[PDB]
Each structure stands twice: as structure tokens, then as C-alpha cells.
């Protein structure tokens, strides 16, 4: 695994907007979306938010992250965590959030990240578990069937 990043650029939107493989995976990384998902609604989040930015191995685009919230001084919010299916499990995630840990750090000179993590994701807990993230509070949302899910909200100091 020889990763590198970049930021996302028009090209990759279609691969990106590829990689939530059902309802529910978009509803964890994305959930103001409708499935199905499309590179109107991915280039819609990149515009309102900040820092969106691209994982690359083997010339592939294998996975997204970007800003969902940015407070310079203060904290930042991850948002939009998607990996391709193949690549999942093998390091993707883990290595784009210390990009965006480090992006933080340096643009924004934030001293916390935030990570939201709806209830259903474990594998997401778990490795924002593996990272240092600690869980905070859980508040009630909706998933798209109106059933209630918790989403714990998470963070983590940056120094
Ligand atoms: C890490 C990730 O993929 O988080 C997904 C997410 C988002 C996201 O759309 O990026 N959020 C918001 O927006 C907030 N409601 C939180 S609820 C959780």
C-alpha cells in the first residue's frame, strides 16, 4: 500500500460518487444525500465544504474525505469518509484521516477533530476507536426510513 493524496479535482467525481455501495453506507458518510448518490450531489458537498481531498495507490482513487466544519483556532469536523470497495479494510481510511488530522493542524490550527459516526457503522467506530478518537455524546437522528439512529459523536486532540 503506497499511498498518496491530493486534493479532489472534477475527474475523480465519478469514481468517487461510485463508492457508497447502498443506502445505508451513503446515510453513514453522507447523510443529507438521496440515494442513489451522483457527482451533482458530490460536487455539491465539495463546494460547501473545505478540504476535499483524495487517496491514491497504484493510480487509483480510492478514497474521499473533506470539512463538514472548520473553525480556525478551534476544531475541525470530518466529513464524507468513502473508500472503494476493493480497498476496504486495508488502510485507506486510516491513512486519509491523518492527512486530514494534518490538514487541520495546518490550515486551521485546530487543536480537536470531530468525527461523527452513526450507530449502525461499526467498522467506522472502531477505527476511529484505533485512531484516538473518544466518544462524547450520542444524539438522536433519522435514517431516510424514519427509523431513529444514534450518532456518536466523537473527538480527538490535535496538537
Ligand atoms: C466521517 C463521515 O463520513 O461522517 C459523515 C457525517 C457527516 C457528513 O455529511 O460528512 N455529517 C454531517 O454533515 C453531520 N450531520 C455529520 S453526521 C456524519
Not at 3 to 30: I, K, M
Not at 118 to 127: D, Q, R
Amino acid at each position: 500500500m503506497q499511498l498518496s493524496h491530493r486534493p479532489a479535482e472534477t475527474g475523480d467525481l465519478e469514481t468517487v460518487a461510485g463508492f457508497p455501495q447502498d443506502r445505508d453506507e451513503l446515510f453513514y458518510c453522507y447523510p443529507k444525500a438521496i440515494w442513489p448518490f451522483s457527482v451533482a450531489q458530490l460536487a455539491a458537498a465539495i463546494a460547501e465544504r473545505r478540504g476535499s481531498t483524495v487517496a491514491v495507490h497504484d493510480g487509483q482513487v480510492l478514497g474521499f474525505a473533506n470539512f463538514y466544519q472548520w473553525q480556525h483556532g478551534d476544531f475541525c469536523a470530518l466529513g464524507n469518509m468513502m473508500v472503494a470497495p476493493a480497498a476496504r479494510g486495508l488502510g485507506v481510511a486510516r491513512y486519509l484521516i491523518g492527512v486530514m488530522e494534518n490538514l487541520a493542524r495546518e490550515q486551521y490550527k485546530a487543536r480537536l477533530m470531530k468525527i461523527s459516526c452513526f450507530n449502525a457503522n461499526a467498522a467506522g467506530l472502531l477505527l476511529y476507536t484505533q485512531l484516538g478518537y473518544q466518544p462524547r455524546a450520542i444524539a438522536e437522528r433519522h435514517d431516510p426510513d424514519g427509523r431513529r439512529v444514534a450518532l456518536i459523536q466523537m473527538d480527538k486532540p490535535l496538537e
